[PDB]
Design a protein around this motif. Structure first.
Motif, PDB file in Angstrom:
ATOM      1  N   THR A 196       0.980  -1.080  -0.097  1.00  0.00           N
ATOM      2  CA  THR A 196       0.160  -0.080  -0.032  1.00  0.00           C
ATOM      3  C   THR A 196       0.814   1.131  -0.096  1.00  0.00           C
ATOM      4  OG1 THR A 196      -1.639  -1.365   1.302  1.00  0.00           O
ATOM      5  CG2 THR A 196      -1.908   1.146   1.231  1.00  0.00           C
ATOM      6  N   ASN A 197       0.451   2.262  -0.636  1.00  0.00           N
ATOM      7  CA  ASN A 197       1.202   3.515  -0.775  1.00  0.00           C
ATOM      8  C   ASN A 197       1.047   4.732  -0.102  1.00  0.00           C
ATOM      9  OD1 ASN A 197       0.972   2.180  -4.199  1.00  0.00           O
ATOM     10  ND2 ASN A 197       3.013   3.016  -3.453  1.00  0.00           N
ATOM     11  N   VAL A 198      -0.301   4.698   0.629  1.00  0.00           N
ATOM     12  CA  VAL A 198      -0.487   5.978   1.379  1.00  0.00           C
ATOM     13  C   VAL A 198      -1.630   5.642   2.352  1.00  0.00           C
ATOM     14  CG1 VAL A 198      -2.010   7.051  -0.201  1.00  0.00           C
ATOM     15  CG2 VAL A 198      -0.789   8.543   1.435  1.00  0.00           C
ATOM     16  N   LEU A 243       5.046  12.879  19.637  1.00  0.00           N
ATOM     17  CA  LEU A 243       4.566  11.865  19.083  1.00  0.00           C
ATOM     18  C   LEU A 243       4.616  11.941  17.613  1.00  0.00           C
ATOM     19  CD1 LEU A 243       3.065   8.975  18.529  1.00  0.00           C
ATOM     20  CD2 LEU A 243       0.904  10.118  19.225  1.00  0.00           C
ATOM     21  N   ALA A 244       4.114  13.269  17.284  1.00  0.00           N
ATOM     22  CA  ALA A 244       3.806  13.672  15.712  1.00  0.00           C
ATOM     23  C   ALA A 244       5.431  13.582  15.200  1.00  0.00           C
ATOM     24  CB  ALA A 244       3.345  15.003  15.637  1.00  0.00           C
ATOM     25  N   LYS A 245       6.206  14.083  15.775  1.00  0.00           N
ATOM     26  CA  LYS A 245       7.621  14.130  15.214  1.00  0.00           C
ATOM     27  C   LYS A 245       8.514  12.896  15.058  1.00  0.00           C
ATOM     28  CE  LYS A 245      10.575  14.424  18.583  1.00  0.00           C
ATOM     29  NZ  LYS A 245      12.020  14.191  18.760  1.00  0.00           N
ATOM     30  N   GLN A 246       7.790  11.968  16.095  1.00  0.00           N
ATOM     31  CA  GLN A 246       8.789  10.765  16.133  1.00  0.00           C
ATOM     32  C   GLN A 246       8.216   9.726  15.197  1.00  0.00           C
ATOM     33  OE1 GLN A 246       6.334   8.676  20.149  1.00  0.00           O
ATOM     34  NE2 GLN A 246       8.584   9.465  20.187  1.00  0.00           N
ATOM     35  N   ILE A 247       7.336  10.040  14.527  1.00  0.00           N
ATOM     36  CA  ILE A 247       6.458   8.784  13.787  1.00  0.00           C
ATOM     37  C   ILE A 247       7.031   8.911  12.078  1.00  0.00           C
ATOM     38  CG2 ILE A 247       4.669   8.270  15.177  1.00  0.00           C
ATOM     39  CD1 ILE A 247       3.320   9.991  13.501  1.00  0.00           C
ATOM     40  N   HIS A 248       8.244   9.533  11.862  1.00  0.00           N
ATOM     41  CA  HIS A 248       8.852   9.586  10.708  1.00  0.00           C
ATOM     42  C   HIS A 248       7.683  10.432   9.700  1.00  0.00           C
ATOM     43  CE1 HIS A 248      11.246   7.848   7.072  1.00  0.00           C
ATOM     44  NE2 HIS A 248      11.308   9.369   7.288  1.00  0.00           N
ATOM     45  N   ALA A 249       7.180  11.611  10.191  1.00  0.00           N
ATOM     46  CA  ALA A 249       6.235  12.396   9.527  1.00  0.00           C
ATOM     47  C   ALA A 249       6.865  13.768   9.017  1.00  0.00           C
ATOM     48  CB  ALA A 249       4.803  12.702  10.109  1.00  0.00           C
ATOM     49  N   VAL A 250       6.972  14.235   8.178  1.00  0.00           N
ATOM     50  CA  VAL A 250       7.467  15.716   7.429  1.00  0.00           C
ATOM     51  C   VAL A 250       6.681  16.682   8.271  1.00  0.00           C
ATOM     52  CG1 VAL A 250       8.075  17.010   5.699  1.00  0.00           C
ATOM     53  CG2 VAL A 250       8.086  14.589   5.305  1.00  0.00           C
ATOM     54  N   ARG A 251       5.421  16.631   8.417  1.00  0.00           N
ATOM     55  CA  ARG A 251       4.514  17.761   8.948  1.00  0.00           C
ATOM     56  C   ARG A 251       2.973  17.079   9.114  1.00  0.00           C
ATOM     57  NH1 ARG A 251       4.429  21.905  12.325  1.00  0.00           N
ATOM     58  NH2 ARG A 251       3.968  19.517  13.291  1.00  0.00           N
ATOM     59  N   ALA A 305      -0.719  16.975   2.048  1.00  0.00           N
ATOM     60  CA  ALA A 305      -0.240  15.316   2.111  1.00  0.00           C
ATOM     61  C   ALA A 305       0.240  15.184   0.545  1.00  0.00           C
ATOM     62  CB  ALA A 305      -1.413  14.449   2.247  1.00  0.00           C
ATOM     63  N   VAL A 306      -0.485  15.723  -0.240  1.00  0.00           N
ATOM     64  CA  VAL A 306       0.057  15.577  -1.685  1.00  0.00           C
ATOM     65  C   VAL A 306       1.345  16.378  -1.922  1.00  0.00           C
ATOM     66  CG1 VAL A 306      -0.249  16.075  -4.105  1.00  0.00           C
ATOM     67  CG2 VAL A 306      -2.391  15.311  -2.893  1.00  0.00           C
ATOM     68  N   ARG A 307       1.467  17.351  -1.284  1.00  0.00           N
ATOM     69  CA  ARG A 307       2.745  18.045  -1.379  1.00  0.00           C
ATOM     70  C   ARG A 307       3.987  17.315  -0.936  1.00  0.00           C
ATOM     71  NH1 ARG A 307      -0.966  22.516  -0.343  1.00  0.00           N
ATOM     72  NH2 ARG A 307      -1.055  23.936  -2.289  1.00  0.00           N
ATOM     73  N   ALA A 308       3.636  16.773   0.371  1.00  0.00           N
ATOM     74  CA  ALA A 308       4.799  15.948   1.042  1.00  0.00           C
ATOM     75  C   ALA A 308       5.064  14.879   0.423  1.00  0.00           C
ATOM     76  CB  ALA A 308       4.161  15.671   2.278  1.00  0.00           C
ATOM     77  N   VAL A 309       4.010  14.088  -0.398  1.00  0.00           N
ATOM     78  CA  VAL A 309       4.355  13.153  -1.190  1.00  0.00           C
ATOM     79  C   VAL A 309       5.296  13.325  -2.530  1.00  0.00           C
ATOM     80  CG1 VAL A 309       3.540  11.009  -2.690  1.00  0.00           C
ATOM     81  CG2 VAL A 309       2.398  11.595  -0.284  1.00  0.00           C
ATOM     82  N   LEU A 310       4.924  14.618  -2.997  1.00  0.00           N
ATOM     83  CA  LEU A 310       5.497  15.110  -4.178  1.00  0.00           C
ATOM     84  C   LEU A 310       7.406  15.240  -3.733  1.00  0.00           C
ATOM     85  CD1 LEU A 310       3.361  17.623  -5.767  1.00  0.00           C
ATOM     86  CD2 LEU A 310       3.788  15.316  -6.577  1.00  0.00           C
ATOM     87  N   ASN A 311       7.529  16.130  -2.756  1.00  0.00           N
ATOM     88  CA  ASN A 311       8.698  16.157  -2.116  1.00  0.00           C
ATOM     89  C   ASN A 311       8.893  15.686  -0.738  1.00  0.00           C
ATOM     90  OD1 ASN A 311       7.795  19.317  -3.471  1.00  0.00           O
ATOM     91  ND2 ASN A 311       9.593  17.620  -4.469  1.00  0.00           N
ATOM     92  N   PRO A 312       9.261  14.341  -0.686  1.00  0.00           N
ATOM     93  CA  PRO A 312       9.284  13.617   0.685  1.00  0.00           C
ATOM     94  C   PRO A 312      10.811  13.469   1.425  1.00  0.00           C
ATOM     95  CG  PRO A 312       9.143  12.051  -0.930  1.00  0.00           C
ATOM     96  CD  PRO A 312       8.972  13.115  -1.741  1.00  0.00           C
ATOM     97  N   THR A 313      10.834  13.063   2.462  1.00  0.00           N
ATOM     98  CA  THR A 313      12.371  12.842   2.799  1.00  0.00           C
ATOM     99  C   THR A 313      13.047  12.065   2.077  1.00  0.00           C
ATOM    100  OG1 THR A 313      13.632  12.128   4.680  1.00  0.00           O
ATOM    101  CG2 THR A 313      11.237  11.129   4.449  1.00  0.00           C
ATOM    102  N   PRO A 314      14.423  12.428   1.833  1.00  0.00           N
ATOM    103  CA  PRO A 314      15.340  11.714   1.104  1.00  0.00           C
ATOM    104  C   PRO A 314      15.244  10.227   1.536  1.00  0.00           C
ATOM    105  CG  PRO A 314      16.309  13.600   1.973  1.00  0.00           C
ATOM    106  CD  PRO A 314      14.874  13.715   2.280  1.00  0.00           C
TER     107      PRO A 314
END
Lengths: 56, 181
Positions: free
Chosen positions: B75-77, B145-153, B172-181
């Motif tokens: 699953t992708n998202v 908790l929000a910042k420790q679950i590997h979430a950009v924002r 969410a779409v913007r984060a998927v477009l430019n996610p973490t390296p």
């Protein structure tokens, strides 16, 4: 006055893929159903697909 | 433009049925109606990209665990709605959700939104949780908790007031477009 039943919801799954929805009317011949399915999904060769039940 | 699969999950007793009814008919019924599962495929375009949200309903019943966990791989998202200030909810999240999504797919974008926060307008639940000696979750621990679950924002949207939902999907779409390296 019962509500009209010309609109129904049905999702047609794929093996390993996520569903897509369409409105299907069974009164029309299966040829029309196949044509509308192919038109909606932009699929060619309408004679190479058919319909089967994924229940038991 | 690239269409992708989608799965929506959540906690127990949070309001999936009203969410699906609102999505399909633009309403907001307070009545509770049982629902087994659903899939919505809607064509909405954001930032010039035509992406179809292949919505999916998931049930927390024990019986259909085989059906529910079958599609979790590849699953992708995720779109997840949860009670914001339920310590059992966070406990179950830490025990079940985060470790599995982290171990299985290190590169699966995750969209998270909290629920059950407008109940301050209803004193009934406040009195219900006061008699049991429960304290609200501290904001610092929530942000941790929000910042420790590997979430950009992490962001939240309202379902009853219908606030931020489109903004949440867009971010969410913007984060998927430019996610973490």
């Amino acid at each position: 006055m019962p509500p009209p039943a010309d609109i129904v919801k049905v999702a047609i799954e794929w093996p390993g893929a996520y569903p897509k929805l369409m409105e299907i009317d069974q009164k029309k011949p299966l040829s029309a159903i196949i044509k509308e399915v192919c038109d909606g999904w932009s699929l060619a060769n309408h004679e190479y697909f058919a319909l089967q039940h994924a229940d038991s | 433009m690239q269409s992708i699969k989608c799965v929506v999950v959540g906690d127990g007793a949070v309001g999936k049925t009203c969410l699906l009814i609102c999505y399909t008919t633009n309403a907001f019924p307070k009545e509770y109606i049982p629902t087994v599962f659903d899939n919505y495929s809607a064509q909405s375009a954001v930032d010039g990209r035509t992406v179809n949200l292949n919505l999916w309903d998931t049930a927390g019943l024990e019986e259909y665990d085989r059906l529910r966990t079958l599609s979790y791989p590849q699953t992708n998202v995720f779109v997840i709605c949860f009670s914001i200030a339920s310590p059992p909810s966070y406990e179950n999240v830490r025990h079940k959700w985060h470790p599995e999504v982290c171990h299985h797919c290190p590169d699966v974008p995750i969209l998270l939104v909290g629920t059950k926060k407008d109940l301050r307008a209803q004193p009934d639940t406040l009195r219900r949780l006061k008699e049991q000696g429960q304290a609200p979750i501290t904001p610092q621990q929530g942000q941790a908790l929000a910042k420790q679950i590997h979430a950009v924002r992490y962001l939240e949207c309202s379902a009853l007031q219908q606030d931020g939902v489109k903004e949440v999907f867009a971010e969410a779409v913007r984060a998927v477009l430019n996610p973490t390296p």
